[PDB]
Amino acid sequence: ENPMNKIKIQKLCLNICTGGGEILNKASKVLEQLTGQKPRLSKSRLTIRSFGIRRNEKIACHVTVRGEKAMEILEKGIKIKEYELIDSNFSTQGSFGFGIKEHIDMGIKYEPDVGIFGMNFYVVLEKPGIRVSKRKRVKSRVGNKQRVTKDEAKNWFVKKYEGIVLG
Amino acid sequence: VSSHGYRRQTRNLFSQAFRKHGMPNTSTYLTQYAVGEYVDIKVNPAIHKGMPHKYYHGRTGIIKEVNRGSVIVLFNRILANKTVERKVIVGIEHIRKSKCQDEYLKRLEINKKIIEEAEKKGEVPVLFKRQPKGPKPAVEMLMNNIIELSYDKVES
Amino acid sequence: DNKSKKSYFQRFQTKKRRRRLCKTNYRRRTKLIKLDQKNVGEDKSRLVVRITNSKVICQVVKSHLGGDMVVAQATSAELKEFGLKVGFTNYSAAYATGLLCARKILRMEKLDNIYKPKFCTDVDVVEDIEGEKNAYRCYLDIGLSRNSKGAKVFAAMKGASDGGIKIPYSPKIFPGYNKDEEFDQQKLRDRIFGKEVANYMQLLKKEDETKFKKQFSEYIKQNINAEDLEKMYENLFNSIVTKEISKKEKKDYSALKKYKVMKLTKEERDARVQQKLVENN
RNA sequence: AGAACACUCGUGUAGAGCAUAAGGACUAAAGAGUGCCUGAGUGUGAGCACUACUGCUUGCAUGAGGGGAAACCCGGGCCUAG
RNA sequence: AGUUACGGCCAUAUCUACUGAAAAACACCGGAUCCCGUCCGAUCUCCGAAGUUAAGCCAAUAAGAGCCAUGCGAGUAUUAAGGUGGGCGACUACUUGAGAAAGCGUGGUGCUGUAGUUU
């Protein structure tokens, strides 16, 4: 087969949303354990009385992982979801996402004062050369040859983890 | 009633042309100016320092003094039925070199040859004046190939 | 939404060519080149430094109406004449190229014998010798590259200064600067003569000899060792200052015009369309 | 977790913003962020708006001046009123 | 003859699909010890050559969209001067002069400056 032209992970995005006070600190400590990083707190775009959100108030924390560490977390999570995904979960862009309701399934000890949180996982796939669209000098749009398509993303998932993609 | 600020009535003037927005081109900055040249004012709305008053837009004058990034130009104006000279300060982004002397300078180059020979051989130059177009010329015609014209088109 | 209607295309204004290509910053260029109307006969020279995956380029350029004129040029790939075997995009190779560039200039102007070289022993700007002709003057053009402490663009710039050209600079940008203390110049000298890489080579042989072979294969092929670098670089600098490279020859590669493709005639284009209708019916 | 919560990928000539009328101006910015500073210095000339008051443009000299690697810029507020 | 570095005039150069490419370059590419900067060596900064023409850059193709030119529209629309011209008016004929636009047809699809490198 032709080298280059082979799929990889470029990014895994993790986010927890918990609008309020000390809850965000309690949450942040979790992300700081699952990955060796300090996560970025994010703030409310609008003011929404019903949801209990003032504008410019912190509401969530996220962290982005790349390289080897990404492989461990993704394997750890797809197990929790028992290798089962729906055709809804894949985009026209070569990316996919799922959710988890209970952080303790990723293995960490309980500590009853910390609490129970869920988490979103989102995954972005790639082929070499993407740098052409991100570098400062001579920045250009990539060729259709080097994108990742909806079918390819499913094929990669099936191959790599032996999972089942339901219609 | 109308008002009397410094940029009154300049909605049409002092606006960019279609598909020509943005800052000036390099040629604007690399042009060298000298005292005594004739120069022509056209304001660039994107530059906010060294703008002249809108009366002077599209007028041509003569350079009196040259500074780091601006020029002083002499103009004449009628006020209270008398002639007044005016000294206008302009930044180099709002001016272009005038073409108004072009033909005269060519004519001077021809005169400069003749006026030397006129000392050696003649006594006075022929001086090569322009003349307005004269009467219609004479013509000799072969008289085959005649074309007739008629009110054939009825124009309902 | 946008690109769905004709009016989008009809009303659109294109950026200048070198902006579409992301090669030039026009706001920076204009501040750098704009003429002073009172200093007639001033003819500012830019020192242009650019770094490619393969090589370092120094050019000395004067901006004239109609197009920029190149006074002189030097490239790290030419240092192969003086026996440089390795690291053509290294911090040392940046410095060496700036040094080379300066000498070629001062030879043309015949200032070469007046303004002598000086290998990296102070951080002052070049100063006009009394009773002789003034130093050649230039200003640095770094393009779209970022300014930060220890960027390779500034190495070439110090090369040129050490070579005899007058550039104004502040020492804030060199390794060995301190926020509120004197300049530690041994750190600067260290990098110029390649200590930074020797120290990496030495580390890897203790850590992982497999990774060492992967990281430094080209060096191994030349039998260079960490110990050899100072002698290598001292020789390289001296030779630049001492010798001169042979002139280039001109040749007509005209015959390679065979490879150029040519556009279809109208007559062909029409027949091709005609055939396409008939193939369809 | 809903019409409307946070995070992403692709398109995106301005359909946004620019405290305060209306017009003009602005796109690797003049918009949004981040760093440092108090030039919202000091003497003294020449001019533009129908030109007194007022507002602005610009010259030369100085500061144990500022910001920036530097070219450059700054004696209030992007320009036209307070 | 191309490319590459720095440019000039700023779409004949744009936008969308497809296809080609000797040499040398230009790139993608392999790491983070240091200098430097990130939630994140993705970007920026540094140190490298195991791979690859798939991408970009360059070039061709398309009764392509858009842009540029020219012919026609057309002596048409409008307009300066004039008369004891006409009309209740609204407005309009004539005499000596100046003179368009949209649409629609046909052709084009970057040109050049200084230096470097490659039969």
Listing DSSP states for C109-150 in one string gives: HT-TTTS----S---PPP-PPTTSPPPPB-EEE-TTSPP-TT
Q: Report the candidate in B27, B31, B101 with the shortest Cα–Cα distance to residue B62.
A: B101
On whether the CB atoms of residues C181 and C117 are closer than 8 A, the answer is: no
How far is it, in rounded angstroms, from Cα A139 to Cα C105?
35
Helix (H) or strand (E) run with residue C101 in it: helix C91-109
Task: Give the Cα-Cα-Cα angle A52, A54, A60 (nearest 5 degrees).
Answer: 75
Q: How many CB atoms lie within 10 A of CB B122?
A: 10
Resolution of this structure in Å: 10.8
* Contact: C35, B19; criterion CB under 8 Å: no
Q: How was this structure determined?
A: cryo-EM
- Measured in angstroms, the CA of A54 and the nearest CA of chain C are apart by 32
Q: Which long-range contacts (CB under 8 A, 24 or more apart) does C142-146 make?
A: C142/C49, C143/C25, C143/C48, C143/C49, C143/C50, C144/A136, C144/A137, C144/C22, C144/C23, C144/C25, C145/C51
Residue pointed to by tokens 């699952």: A34
How far is it, in rounded angstroms, from Cα C173 to Cα C155?
10
Residue pointed to by tokens 């394997």: A75
* Contact: B32, C37; criterion CB under 8 Å: yes
Q: How far is CA C66 from CA B25, B113, C22, C267, in A?
A: 12, 32, 21, 39
Residue A137, chain C, CB below 8 Å: the answer is: yes
Query: SS3 of C29, please?
Result: helix
Q: Which long-range contacts (CB under 8 A, 24 or more apart) does A90-95 make?
A: A90/A150, A90/A153, A90/A154, A91/A150, A91/A153, A92/A150, A93/A148, A94/A124, A94/A125, A94/A126, A94/A147, A94/A148, A94/A149, A94/A150, A94/A152, A94/A153, A95/A122, A95/A123, A95/A124, A95/A125, A95/A153
- Please give the span between the terminal C-alpha atoms of chain B, in angstroms, as a whole number: 53
Query: SS3 of C106, please?
Result: helix
Q: How many CB atoms lie within 10 A of CB A89?
A: 16
Residue pointed to by tokens 């002709």: C133
Tokens of C280: 């369809």
Going by the DSSP 8-state scheme, the letter that residue C36 receives in this structure is P
CA B114, B117, B121, B124 torsion-angle sign: positive
Q: Which long-range contacts (CB under 8 A, 24 or more apart) does A149-155 make?
A: A149/A94, A150/A90, A150/A91, A150/A92, A150/A94, A152/A7, A152/A94, A153/A90, A153/A91, A153/A94, A153/A95, A153/A96, A153/A125, A154/A90
Q: How far is CA B93 from CA B63, B96, B143, C215, in A?
A: 15, 8, 62, 55
Residue-level length of chain B: 156
The 3-class SS string of chain B reads CCCCCCCCCCCCCCCCCCCCCCCCCHHHHHCCCCCCCEEEECCCCCCCCCCCCCCCCCCEEEEEEECCCEEEEEEEEEECCEEEEEEEEEEHHHEEECCCCHHHHHHHHHHHHHHHHHHHCCCCCCCCCCCCCCCCCCCCCCCCCCCCCCCCCCCC
Going by the DSSP 8-state scheme, the letter that residue A114 receives in this structure is T
Tokens of C173: 């940008």
Q: Which of strand E's nucleotides are less than 7 A from any protein C-beta? A: 1-2, 5-11, 13-18, 21-23, 25-31, 33-37, 39-52, 54-63, 65-67, 107-110, 112-119
User: Would the Cβ of A124 be found within 7 angstroms of any atom in strand D?
Assistant: yes
Helix (H) or strand (E) run with residue C18 in it: helix C17-20
Cβ contacts of B43 within 8 Å, gap of 6 or more: B13, B14, B51, B52, B54, B57, B94
